[PDB]
Design a protein around this ligand. Sequence first.
Ligand code: CLA
Ligand code: CLA
Ligand code: CLA
Ligand code: CLA
Ligand SMILES: CCCCCCCCCCCCCCCC(=O)OC[C@H](COP(=O)(O)OC[C@@H](O)CO)OC(=O)CCCCCCCCCCCCCCC
Ligand SMILES: CC1=C(/C=C/C(C)=C/C=C/C(C)=C\C=C\C=C(C)\C=C\C=C(C)\C=C\C2=C[C@H](C)[C@H](O)CC2(C)C)C(C)(C)C[C@@H](O)C1
Ligand SMILES: CC1=C(/C=C/C(C)=C/C=C/C(C)=C/C=C/C=C(C)/C=C/C=C(C)/C=C/C2=C(C)CCCC2(C)C)C(C)(C)CCC1
Lengths: 31, 69, 142, 729, 80, 75, 40, 40, 75
Amino acid sequence: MALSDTQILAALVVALLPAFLAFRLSTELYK
Amino acid sequence: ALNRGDKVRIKRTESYWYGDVGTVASVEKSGILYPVIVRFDRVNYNGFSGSASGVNTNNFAENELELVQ
Amino acid sequence: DDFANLTPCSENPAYLAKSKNFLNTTNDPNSGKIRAERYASALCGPEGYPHLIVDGRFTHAGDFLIPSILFLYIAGWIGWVGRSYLIEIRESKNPEMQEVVINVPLAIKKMLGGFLWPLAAVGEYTSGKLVMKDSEIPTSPR
Amino acid sequence: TKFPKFSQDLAQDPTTRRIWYGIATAHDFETHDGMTEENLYQKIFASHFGHIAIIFLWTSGTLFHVAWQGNFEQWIKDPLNIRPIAHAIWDPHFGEGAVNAFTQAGASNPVNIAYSGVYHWFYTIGMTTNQELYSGAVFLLVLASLFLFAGWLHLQPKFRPSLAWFKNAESRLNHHLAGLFGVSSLAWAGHLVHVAIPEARGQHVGWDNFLSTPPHPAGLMPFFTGNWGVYAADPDTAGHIFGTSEGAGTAILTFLGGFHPQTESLWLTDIAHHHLAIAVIFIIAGHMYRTNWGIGHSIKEILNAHKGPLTGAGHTNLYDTINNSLHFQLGLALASLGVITSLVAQHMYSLPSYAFIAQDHTTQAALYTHHQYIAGFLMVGAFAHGAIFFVRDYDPVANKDNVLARMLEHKEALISHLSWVSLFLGFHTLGLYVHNDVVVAFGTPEKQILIEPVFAQWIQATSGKALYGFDVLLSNPDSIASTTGAAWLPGWLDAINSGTNSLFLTIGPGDFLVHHAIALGLHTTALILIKGALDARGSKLMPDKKDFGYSFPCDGPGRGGTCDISAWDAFYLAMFWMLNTLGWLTFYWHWKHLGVWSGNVAQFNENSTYLMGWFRDYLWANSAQLINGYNPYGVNNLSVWAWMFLFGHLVWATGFMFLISWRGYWQELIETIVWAHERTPLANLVRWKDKPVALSIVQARLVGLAHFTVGYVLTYAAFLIASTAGKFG
Amino acid sequence: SHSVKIYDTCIGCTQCVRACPLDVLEMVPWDGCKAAQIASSPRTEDCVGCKRCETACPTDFLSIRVYLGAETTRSMGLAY
Amino acid sequence: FGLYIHNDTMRALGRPQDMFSDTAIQLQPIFAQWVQHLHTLAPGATAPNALATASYAFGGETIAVAGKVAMMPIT
Amino acid sequence: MDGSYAASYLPWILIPMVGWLFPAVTMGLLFIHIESEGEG
Amino acid sequence: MDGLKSFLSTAPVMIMALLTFTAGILIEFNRFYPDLLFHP
Amino acid sequence: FGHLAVVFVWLSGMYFHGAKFSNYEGWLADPTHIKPSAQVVWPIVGQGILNGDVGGGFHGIQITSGLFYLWRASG
Ligand code: CLA
Ligand code: CLA
Ligand code: CLA
Ligand code: CLA
Ligand SMILES: CCCCCCCCCCCCCCCC(=O)OC[C@H](COP(=O)(O)OC[C@@H](O)CO)OC(=O)CCCCCCCCCCCCCCC
Ligand SMILES: CC1=C(/C=C/C(C)=C/C=C/C(C)=C\C=C\C=C(C)\C=C\C=C(C)\C=C\C2=C[C@H](C)[C@H](O)CC2(C)C)C(C)(C)C[C@@H](O)C1
Ligand SMILES: CC1=C(/C=C/C(C)=C/C=C/C(C)=C/C=C/C=C(C)/C=C/C=C(C)/C=C/C2=C(C)CCCC2(C)C)C(C)(C)CCC1
C-alpha cells in the first residue's frame, strides 16, 4: 500500500538532523 | 682552452642547442661570465610571432661546452 | 572448416542474384562481367559482397599479403630516395635553399638509384650510419 | 575585501576576476596561504567525509522519491509491461497538452519514467513493498547524519589526526582490503543468502523473522563438518518463475552458470558463491602487510628489492614518492576507477544481473552510456592529476635513475612512436571508410573493402561460440579445457550459443572498422595526455615551465608565439578527443543494439561499412520520433526530450564563443560599455564595486569547454533516450 | 604586481629597456659583460606583463623573465 | 531571438495560444504589407503608362509556365 | 498542479521555496559576503 | 633560360608535376584494368 | 589587367564547354522537357554514373548556372 502523509512529515523531521550536522561541518571546514 | 674554428657541443640544458654542434666565433679577456661565443647552423625560436628566422649565435662559458673538432 | 558463416560467392544466392546487374566502371561494356567472374572466387557474406581474410593464411594471400609487399616496396623506395637526397644536399653550403628549389639532376640520380633500397638500408644499418647515438642529438629539458 | 580568505593575491584584486578565481581555486588546498601538510591532510579527510555524506543523501533521496511517487508495488506485478516511475512532475508553467501527454505509466498526474533501472535492482535484492523502500531511505538519512558528525568530530582539535596516521600505508591497505572489501563482500553474500534468494523463491524474510528461519534445511552443520556440497544440491530448475515457489530449488550456493531462463539474468546462487569467494580471497589478501606484529611484507623493502639490470634503479624510492605526493595517489585511484568503470559497463551490458533488465532496452542503453562516459572522465582526470604531480611533487634527485625518472629520459621516443601509431591508424581507417563511401556512391557497392574481424571471432570461439566453426578450445569438444567437467560449462555454453542475448554478439566487418576507429581515438587521447604530462616540467620552447606552475595562459607572442603551452592546455585539448571517442563508442553500441533488439541485424551489417549509412540509417532515421515530440498538431511524452535535444544543440554552439573568440575584443567592448554606463544620467547613481573586466584566457577556455561538454552530453542523452523509448518503450 | 627578474646572462644590449612601454626597466653599471651594464627593474609595480621585454631579449632562452602574479589596477592596465 | 525561444517553449508545454503565431499573438509586418499594396496599385494611377506591376511578388495574378509556377504573390 | 501521492500539498510550498526563496536568500548572502571589505 | 629552368625546379611546380604523373599512372592502370580488389 | 585576363579565360571556357559538351541545340527545341547540361564525365572508376539522363538522349551533369537561358536571351 502507498505511504501515509505522516510518514512523509516524519521523513522531513528526520532529514532536519543531517541538515544541522551538515551546517556544522561546513562551518567547521570554513575555519 | 678553445679558440676560433672549434666544433663544440652544448651542455647548458636550457639552451636551444643542447646537444647540437656549434662553431667558436670568438673569445675575449677575463672578467666576463660567459666569454665564449658560439654560432649555430640551426636558428632558435627567437622572434615575434610569424617571424621568418631566429638567432644563430649565443654566449657560453667555458665549462658549458665539450670540444669535438 | 574456418568461416562456417561465410560461403564462396560462386555458391551464394545473394551474390548470384545481385551479380547480374553489376555496373560498368569504364566505357568497356564487359567490365561488369569481368568484375563478376573475378569476384566469384572470393568469400562472400550473406549480403553477397566479398570479404577479405588477413589471419596470415596463404590461401587468402592475395587479400592482404601481396598488396602488403607491393605497398612496402614503393614506400621504402620513396623514403630512401628522400633521405639520400637530403643527406647529399646537406653539405652544399645552402641545403635550405636547395630544399625549395629542387636540384633536378641530383634528384633524378637518386630516383634511379633507389630500387635497391632494401639492400642499401640493411648495409647502412650494419655500418652504423642509419641511426645516431642519443648523445649526438638535441634534446628538450626533462 | 574579505573573500577569498584563503588567498591574499585574489583578495586585493579590484576587478571581477577576484570572484571568478576565488570560486575556481577554492578546493585547491595545496596552494592556500599558510597551509601546512597536517592541516592539508585533515581538511582533505573532512571533505572526503562530506562527499560520502552527500552520496548517501543522494541515494536516500532516490529511494524516497521512488517509494513516494513511484509505482513499484505495481511494477513488480508486471515488470515486462509497466513503466517504472522516477518522480512526479510539478511544473506550474505547464499547459494542458503537456499535462495530458505526461500522465503516463498509468498514473493520475504528470510523471516521469525512470531509466536508471533502480526498480530492477530493488526487485532483485528482495525489496517487494514500498515500506521497505521508505525504511531504507530513513536509514540512509541516519547514515549520512552519522558521517557528517564524524567529519565534524575528526575535525576537532583533540580528535585531529596526526601526519603519521595519514602516512601509514600498510595498516590502511590491510584494513581496507580485509575490512572494506572482504568483510563488506562477505556481508553482501550473507544478505543474498539470508534474504535475497528466499525472497526470489517466494518466501518473505524481514527483520522480524530472519533470525528464526535458516536459509538452508541443514544450517551450519555441513559448513563445519566439511560437507559443503550439500548447499549446492537441488538448485532452481529452468522452469522457475521468479518471485514464486513454482519450480524452485533449495540450494543456496551453486555454480549453475549461464542465465536464468525467465529473467535472462545471472543466477542469484551464482552471485552468492561469487561474492563469498571474492570475500574469502580479499580477506586472505588483507593479511599481507606488516603493521606492528612483525609478520607481513613491507612495501618499501618490496619496491627497493625489485630492481632491474636494464632499468638502472628499478622501483627504487617509489614508496617515498607515492607516499609524499597526493597527486600521484589521486592519479592512480582515478586510473583504476576509470578502468573498472569501463569494465563494469562492458561486463554488465552483456551479463545482466537484475531481473528483467535485459528486456528494458532504454535503461540498459542509458546505463552503458552513463558509466562509459564516467569512465572516460575518470581516465582523463588520472592523466591530468599525474601531470600536476610532475609539476609539483616530482623530485629529480630523490627519484634518480628509477623507472619514474627514466620516462623523461626516453619521452621523445614515447611521444614520437605514439604519434606514429595514431597517424597510422587514422590515415588508413579514414581511407577505408572513404573508399567504401565512394564505391557505394557510384552504385557499385560490391567493391567495398570488407575485412572480417578474424581474431575477435577466434576469441569468441575459444570461449565456446560454435557459429563461426573454428572449433578451438571450448568450441572444440575434444580439447582438454572442454572436458574438465567444470560445473559452469553446460549452462555457459548454452547461454553463449544462443543469439537471444548480448552475450558475445555476432560480429562482422563494420565491427572491425569501428573497433579500429576506437583504437585510433584511444591512442590519440593517450598521446595528448601523455605529451602534456611529460612536457609539464619543460620543453625546448619553455625550458622553465615548472617555475610557472600548472595552469598559466601563455608566454606571450614572443619566440614565435606560445598559445596553449601549459599542461592545463593539454588537458583542455584532450577533453575534446575524449568526447569524440566516447561519441564513436556509444554510437556504435547504440546502433548495433538497436539492430539486435529489432531483429534487423542486417541493417547494421550492411550500412555500417560506409559513413553515409551512419548518417542516414542511424542519425537521420532515428531522429524522426524525437523531433516530433511537439508539433504544430500537438505534443506527446517525448516533448521534454526534444526540448533538451535543442537545448544541447544550443549550449554546444554557445561554447564556441569562448572557444573561438578571445579576450582583447571583449575587453575593448567592455571598456565601451563602461563608458556608456558612466555617462548615463539616472544610472550613475548605481555604480559597481568590482571593476568589470573580460574573462581571463584560462577561464575563457574552461568556460567554453564546460558549455561544450554540457551540450555534448545533453544532446546525445536526449537523442538516445527518445529514440529508444519511442521505438520500444 | 608582476615580478621581473634579470639573470646573469644579460649582455647589456638595452633592447629590453627600449621595448618596455610602461618604463619599468633601467640600465645600471655592471662588470660581468663586455658592455659593462645590466638590466634592472626598479618599477615593477608599473609592469603590466606584456612580455615585450622578453620578446626583445636576444640571449639564449631569456636573461629577463616576467612572472605574472597579483593583479592591481595598474598591472591590469585599466583606465576606469 | 527570444521570440523564437519563447515560441519553442510555449509549443513544448502545450500552450499554442501563448505563441507568437498567426492564430495567436500576431506580429503583422503591416508596413511591408502597405508597401506591397501600394506597389500593386502602381500600374493603375501612380505609373499610368505601365501595363503590369514591376513584379508579381508584390501582388496580382499568378504567372505559370508549363505546369510550374513562375512567379506568384509572396505574402 | 496536483497529484494522487500522499501529502500532495508539500510540492505547492516546497518547490517555490527551493525555486525562489532559497536562491534569493543564498545569492543575497553570498553577494553580501563576497563584498565585505577588509579582513582579507 | 637560366631563370626559366630555376623557376621550373621550384618546390610547387615539381610536386605538381610528380602528382600529375602519378595520377596519370593510376588513371591509365584503372582504365585498362578496373575493379582489382586483390591479386588472385 | 591580369585578373581581367583570368576572367576572360574563364568566360571563354564556359562558352566552349557550352558549345561542344552541351545539349544547347537540343534544349533549344523543347526547353520545357530537356534539362540543361554542359558537363560530361569520363567513365573511369564509375563516375560515369554522374552522366545522368537530362532528356533527349543526352547524358551529362545537369547545370544550374542558367547559361542556357542567358544564351537564348542573347539570340
Ligand atoms: C520557462 C521554462 C520553464 C521553467 C521555468 C520550468 C520550471 C520547472 N520545471 Mg519544467 N519544462 C519546461 C519549461 C520550464 N520548466 C519545458 C519546455 C518542458 C518540456 C515539456 C519541461 C518539462 C519538465 C519536466 C518533465 C519536469 C519539469 C520540472 C520543473 C521544475 C523543477 C524545479 C527545479 O528544477 O528546481 C531545482 C532547480 C535546479 C535543479 C536548477 C539548477 C541549475 C543550475 C545550473 C545548478 C546550480 C549550479 C550552481 C552550483 C548554483 C549555485 C547556487 C545557486 C543557488 C546560486 C520547475 C518548476 C520538474 C518538476 O516538476 O519538478 C518536480 C519535472 O519533472 N519540467
Ligand atoms: C576495517 C576498517 C576500516 C574500514 C571499513 C574503512 C573504511 C573506509 N575508509 Mg579507512 N582507514 C582504516 C580502516 C578502515 N577504513 C585505517 C586503519 C586507517 C588508518 C591507517 C584508515 C585511513 C583512512 C583514510 C586516510 C581515509 C579512509 C577512508 C575510508 C572510506 C573510503 C570511502 C569509500 O569509498 O568507501 C566506500 C567503498 C566501498 C564500498 C568499496 C569500493 C568499491 C569497489 C571499487 C568495488 C565496487 C563494488 C561493486 C562492484 C559495486 C557495487 C554496485 C552496487 C552499488 C549496486 C571508507 C568508509 C577515506 C575517507 O575519507 O573516508 C571517510 C580516507 O580519506 N580511511
Ligand atoms: C576524486 C576526484 C577528484 C579530486 C578529489 C580532485 C582534486 C583536485 N583537482 Mg581534479 N580532476 C578530476 C578528479 C578529481 N580532482 C577529474 C576526473 C578530472 C578530469 C576532468 C580533473 C581535472 C582537474 C584539472 C584540470 C585541475 C584539477 C585540479 C584539482 C585540485 C583542486 C582545484 C579544483 O578542481 O577545484 C575547483 C573546481 C571547479 C571550479 C569545478 C567547477 C566546475 C563545475 C563542477 C561544472 C558544472 C557544470 C554545470 C554547472 C552543469 C550544470 C548542468 C545544467 C545546466 C543542466 C584538486 C587537487 C586543479 C589543479 O591543478 O589543482 C592544483 C586543475 O587545474 N583537476
Ligand atoms: C574531423 C576533425 C579532425 C580531424 C580529421 C583531425 C585529425 C588529426 N588530429 Mg585533431 N583535433 C580536432 C579535430 C580533428 N583532428 C579537434 C576539434 C581538436 C580539438 C582542439 C583536435 C585536437 C588535436 C590534438 C590535440 C592532436 C590532434 C591530432 C590529430 C592527428 C592525429 C592523426 C589522426 O587521428 O588521423 C590521421 C590524420 C587524419 C585522418 C587527417 C588527414 C586527413 C586528410 C584527408 C589526409 C590527406 C590530406 C589531404 C589530401 C590534403 C589535401 C589538402 C588540399 C586539398 C588543399 C590528425 C592530423 C594529434 C596529432 O598531431 O597527431 C600526431 C594531436 O596531438 N588533434
Ligand atoms: C568559401 C571561401 C573559403 C575562403 C574563405 C576565406 C578565408 C579568409 C581569407 C584569409 C585572409 C586572407 C589574407 C590572408 C592573411 C595574410 O595575408 O597572411 C596571414 C598569414 C601570416 O600572417 P603573419 O602575421 O604570421 O605574417 C607576418 C608575415 O607576413 C611577416 O611578413 O599568412 C597566411 O595565412 C598564409 C596563407 C598562405 C596560403 C598558403 C597556401 C597558398 C594557397 C594559394 C591558393 C589560393 C587559392 C587559389 C585560387 C583558388
Ligand atoms: C629502412 C627505411 C626507413 C627506416 C626504417 C626503420 C628505422 C625501422 C625501424 C623499426 C623498428 C625499430 C621497429 C619495428 C617493429 C615492427 C614490428 C613490431 C612488426 C610487427 C608485425 C606484425 C605484428 C605483423 C602482423 C601481421 C602479419 C601477417 C602479414 C598477417 O597476415 C597480418 C598481421 C597484421 C596479423 C626509413 C623510414 C628511414 C625510410 C624507408 O623508406 C626505409
Ligand atoms: C603520468 C603519470 C601517471 C598517469 C598515468 C596513468 C594514469 C596511466 C594509466 C595507465 C593504465 C590505465 C593502464 C592500464 C593497464 C592495463 C593492463 C596492463 C591490463 C592488463 C590485462 C591483462 C594482462 C589481462 C589478461 C587476461 C586476459 C586477457 C584474459 C584472461 C584473463 C587474464 C586476466 C589473464 C600516474 C598518475 C600514474 C603517476 C605519475 C605519472
